[PDB]
């Protein structure tokens, strides 16, 4: 069968499919190209999904679940979930394992069983159009999702009876929808995604060589707490302050009124993106001892812009960081893509256009670009789309320099991404206070034959003998392919870190050379590791005795570089007889000859 693309949003979901060569966004059973991400369980035992559920949320607040993406994959005691516990009108509870679950009519349900209801409708939407079963899907997630959030989204898919063939970040999906059928030429794009639940920004390179289009992320970030929800709650606060001032009542203590007020405020926000003024009209919004009370408040676009301007101006500073991290100026960005329903606000479009100096592209639909890109990825997996290349694996092994100029691999070539691997190293010399984490890319055993991706220092290590300190080095490649290298001194807690650009990378011409070069040199590289491993067990023991005095000692400095194992192993036996004939509050003594298997770092 077909592999469908689903944009699984906080607020809205969308299903798309490849129709031979062109993607088509599908209308649900109600004639809508998007479906609200809302699931409701009614008193008479039915499960409503989408617009039918949205329409009755205000009359059935306890049993209508929405914004489950804020909970899926999170622990119940996370502060973000606890803040969420108070404000949401449905019951959020701790599962037996501490996960954040929800409770409806006495049934405890996991967030993925709830999101699966939207996916069952998305699967059904596609099956009605195609006339055959659907079982495979590509589903999108925000770029800030961690490992657990990604697992939970896949889990939701399995419960909906869909096999989730691939997960791809939402900004990457948006670039794929735009990158089919693009006006030819290499372009740099900025994807500005402001949805109901979060802001995410990406800098994405779309290149073209021999008819094949490749997609590479140069930087990505955002703000996980700016979204259409936060625009609403600025308007909500204004209406509360205006009503308190006009009628002396604070609505915040009237749950029935606040549910009505949040929906009225959101529809007003939306309406003011198209009109210059609007009226919020809520009869019987509350009551006190003197009878019913009624709200009728005028909100102009100028007033609205005043309430939320601060949120938009704070979204600009994350773009500058993305440019710093991509090493680019605004002037190198050739196109801007607006994604997300909240970007339809004119102040947002104007404010973004002002930063980049160019008008955002008008042929990318902000509610649909992500789902279409998800459909594109599905078509690549079936082979139906061929001018698309997404690299989901490391092209080359990645590692660090360890004592003796050796490349030590932390993540092997062709490992599926995202992935994360750590290993603990130590210091190479007595009383060494710092180590230089030297990051390398390539297949050779000599560090000097590989590509340097960058380096950094970690300081503050206590004077101690070699091999006694513990330095944890972690390589993390995120799903969008960006490499984060960190180093941590485990006994003190100190940490230093770097991010490594794609530009400091190696190209396909160069990747194929590194692979061809290494196989031809397999025995020679093995020989270098062998004469290193012994060279360094030997300079192991003259550092150990120059410090012990405080002699063929200049003759073993010679016979370390003389590339022979038994040549150093003789200058071992030679100063092993120039030596064989003639406990306080700090580190510990030797007293025996054992050493440890932990690899060593220069610094
Ligand atoms: N016409 C509009 N003008 C301005 N804002 C709008 C408009 N239409 C939708 N919004 C706002 O956009 C938000 C929904 O955006 P969207 O449907 O793209 O979010 P989503 O993809 O579900 O969210 P997320 O990307 O975090 O998962 C809503 O909170 C809504 O208030
Ligand atoms: Mg979205």
Q: Can you offer a commentary on this structure?
A:
- The protein is an alpha+beta fold and 603 residues long.
- Among the domains are: 228-309, Alpha-Beta Complex (Actin, Chain A, domain 4); 393-511, Substrate Binding Domain Of DNAk, Chain A, domain 1 (Sandwich), CATH 2.60.34.10.
- Helix 5 (170-179) crosses helix 11.
- Adenosine-5'-triphosphate is lined by residues 9-12, 37, 69, 195-198, 227-229, 266, 269-270, 273, 340-342, 344-345, 367.
- The site of magnesium ion has 5 residues, from loops.
- The PDB classes it as chaperone.
- The entry lists the keywords molecular chaperone, Hsp70, protein folding, chaperone.
- It forms a monomeric assembly.
- Intermediate state (QQQ) of near full-length DnaK alternatively fused with a substrate peptide.
Q: What amount of the residues lies in strands?
A: 25-35%
CATH homology superfamily of the domain at 393-511: Substrate Binding Domain Of DNAk, Chain A, domain 1
Bound ions, cofactors and other small molecules, one mention each: adenosine-5'-triphosphate, magnesium ion
The general outline is elongated
Give the number of helices. Answer: 15
Radius of gyration: 30 Å
Task: Name the CATH class of the domain at 393-511.
Answer: Mainly Beta
Structural class estimated from helices and strands: alpha+beta
CATH architecture descriptor of the domain at 393-511:
Sandwich
Helix content bin: 25-40%
Total strands: 28
CATH topology of the domain at 393-511: Substrate Binding Domain Of DNAk, Chain A, domain 1
């Amino acid at each position: 069968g077909k592999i469908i693309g689903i944009d699984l949003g906080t607020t809205n979901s969308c299903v798309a499919i490849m129709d031979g060569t062109t993607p088509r966004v599908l209308e649900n059973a109600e004639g809508d190209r998007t479906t609200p991400s809302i699931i409701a369980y009614t008193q008479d035992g039915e499960t409503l999904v989408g617009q039918p559920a949205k329409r009755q949320a205000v009359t059935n607040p306890q049993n209508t679940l929405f914004a489950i993406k804020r909970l899926i994959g999170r622990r119940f005691q996370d502060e973000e979930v606890q803040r969420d516990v108070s404000i949401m009108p449905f019951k959020i509870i701790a599962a037996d394992n501490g996960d954040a679950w929800v409770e409806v009519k006495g049934q405890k349900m996991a967030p993925p069983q709830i999101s699966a209801e939207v996916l069952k409708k998305m699967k059904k939407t596609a099956e009605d159009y195609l006339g055959e079963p659907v079982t495979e899907a590509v589903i999108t997630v925000p770029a800030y999702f961690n490992d657990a959030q990604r697992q939970a989204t896949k889990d939701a898919g399995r419960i909906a009876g869909l096999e989730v063939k691939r997960i791809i970040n939402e900004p990457t999906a948006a670039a794929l929808a735009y990158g089919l059928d693009k006006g030819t030429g290499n372009r740099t794009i900025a994807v500005y995604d402001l949805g109901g639940g979060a802001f995410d920004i990406s800098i994405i390179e779309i290149d073209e060589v021999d008819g094949e289009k490749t997609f590479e992320v140069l930087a990505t970030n955002g703000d996980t707490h700016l979204g259409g929800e936060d625009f609403d709650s600025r308007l909500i606060n204004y209406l509360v302050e205006e009503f308190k001032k006009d009628q002396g009542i604070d609505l915040r203590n009237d749950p029935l009124a606040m549910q009505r007020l949040k929906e009225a405020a959101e529809k007003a926000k939306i309406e003011l993106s198209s009109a210059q003024q609007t009226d919020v009209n809520l009869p019987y919004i509350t009551a006190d001892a003197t009878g019913p009370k009624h709200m009728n408040i005028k909100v102009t676009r100028a007033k609205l812009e005043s309430l939320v301007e601060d949120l938009v101006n704070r979204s600009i500073e994350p773009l500058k960081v993305a440019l710093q991290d991509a090493g680019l100026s605004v002037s190198d960005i050739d196109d801007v893509i607006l994604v997300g329903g909240q970007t339809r606000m004119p102040m947002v479009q104007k404010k973004v256009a002002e930063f980049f100096g160019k008008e955002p592209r008008k042929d990318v639909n902000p509610d649909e670009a992500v789902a279409i890109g998800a459909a594109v990825q599905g078509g690549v997996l079936t082979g139906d789309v061929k001018d698309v290349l997404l690299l989901d694996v490391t092209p080359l092994s990645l590692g660090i320099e360890t004592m003796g100029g050796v490349m030590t691999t932390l993540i092997a070539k062709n490992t599926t991404i995202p992935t994360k691997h750590s290993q603990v190293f130590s210091t190479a010399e007595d009383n060494q206070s710092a180590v230089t984490i030297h990051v390398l890319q390539g297949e050779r055993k000599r560090a000097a034959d590989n590509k340097s991706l960058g380096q950094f220092n970690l300081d503050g290590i206590n004077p101690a003998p070699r091999g006694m300190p513990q330095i944890e080095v972690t390589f993390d490649i995120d799903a969008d392919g960006i490499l984060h290298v960190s180093a941590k001194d485990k006994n003190s807690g100190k940490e230093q870190k770097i991010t490594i650009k794609a530009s400091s990378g190696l190209n396909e011409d160069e990747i194929q050379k590194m692979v061809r070069d290494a196989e031809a040199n397999a025995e020679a590289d093995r020989k270098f590791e062998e004469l290193v491993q012994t060279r360094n067990q030997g300079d192991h023991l003259l550092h150990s005795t120059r410090k012990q005095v405080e002699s063929a000692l200049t003759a073993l400095e010679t016979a370390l570089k003389g590339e022979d194992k038994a040549a150093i192993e003789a200058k071992m036996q030679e100063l092993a007889q120039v030596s064989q004939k003639l406990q306080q509050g700090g580190s510990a003594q030797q007293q025996t000859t054992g050493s440890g298997n932990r690899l060593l770092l220069t610094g």
